[PDB]
Amino acid sequence: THRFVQKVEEMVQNHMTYSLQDVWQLVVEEGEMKVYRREVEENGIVLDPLKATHAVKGVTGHEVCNYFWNVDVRNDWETTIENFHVVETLADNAIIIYQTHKRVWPASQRDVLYLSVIRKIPALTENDPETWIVCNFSVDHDSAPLNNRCVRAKINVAMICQTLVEGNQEISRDNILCKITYVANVNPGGWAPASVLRAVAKREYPKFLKRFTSYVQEKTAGKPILF
Numbered sequence: 001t002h003r004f005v006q007k008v009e010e011m012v013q014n015h016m017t018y019s020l021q022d023v024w025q026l027v028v029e030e031g032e033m034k035v036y037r038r039e040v041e042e043n044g045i046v047l048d049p050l051k052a053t054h055a056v057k058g059v060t061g062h063e064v065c066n067y068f069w070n071v072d073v074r075n076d077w078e079t080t081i082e083n084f085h086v087v088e089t090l091a092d093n094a095i096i097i098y099q100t101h102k103r104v105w106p107a108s109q110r111d112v113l114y115l116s117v118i119r120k121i122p123a124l125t126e127n128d129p130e131t132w133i134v135c136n137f138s139v140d141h142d143s144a145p146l147n148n149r150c151v152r153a154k155i156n157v158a159m160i161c162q163t164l165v166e167g168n169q170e171i172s173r174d175n176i177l178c179k180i181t182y183v184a185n186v187n188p189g190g191w192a193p194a195s196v197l198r199a200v201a202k203r204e205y206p207k208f209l210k211r212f213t214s215y216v217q218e219k220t221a222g223k224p225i226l227f
């Protein structure tokens with residue numbers, strides 16, 4: 001019932017419709033992780049859509065999404081931010097976050113102001129696993145005005161997670177696989193030199209996906225499974 005409910009449903013639906021389609025240049029492949037990028041410059045602004053897939057043993061989609069969304073563990077895995085805070089809590093599954101990013105010479109420092117929502121998308125019936133999604137997308141908020149010290153990036157990011165699993169036995173983490181699709185469409189919000197930006201992305205996206213997925217595996221190991 002919060003004021004962004006209509007926008008959230010639009011953003012989530014568009015991801016479920018378009019973000020799972022099969023793709024674009026391979027940036028890196030390492031184990032089960034594949035990172036792809038489409039080269040796109042629009043009016044000189046580098047928009048380069050990013051899409052990655054991964055298959056992570058021993059964690060569920062619900063777990064992966066909880067850890068990606070939960071701001072309390074953010075600093076345990078995220079390495080590209082200087083500072084962040086929660087501007088507003090909209091619902092138990094929806095918050096607005098302001099954050100500033102590490103500065104990359106020679107461009108101005110970027111900041112971002114986004115709604116971050118976590119949603120369970122049921123299967124047709126409970127015979128099949130639900131999909132979990134976290135969507136982070138830019139919004140306006142009067143408590144976080146555009147400022148003169150940072151260039152305001154505009155983002156649409158999603159992490160979409162599918163969970164793949166004898167007699168009376170218990171399910172073990174060794175027999176669960178989480179298939180992750182991560183998409184990032186980032187508008188840097190102003191001019192940035194293309195070569196510099198592209199080198200940063202090439203390095204930082206795979207770094208993040210490795211670090212983040214390893215983190216969840218480490219923190220869930222030996223804990224009861226949250227489906």
Ligand SMILES: CCCCCCCCCCCCC/C=C/[C@@H](O)[C@H](CO)NC(=O)CCCCCCCCCCCCCCCCC
Nearest residue numbers: 080101102104107110136153157188192196197201204208
């Ligand atoms: C050490 C250098 C790093 C500096 C970072 C540059 C600024 C980035 C601009 C905003 C990107 C938005 C990131 C998305 C964040 C959230 O959804 C989420 C929680 O924070 N994290 C990720 O998805 C994890 C996403 C990890 C993203 C890293 C890739 C960076 C994208 C490149 C865009 C370049 C921005 C222009 C800066 C100047 C370039 C010359």
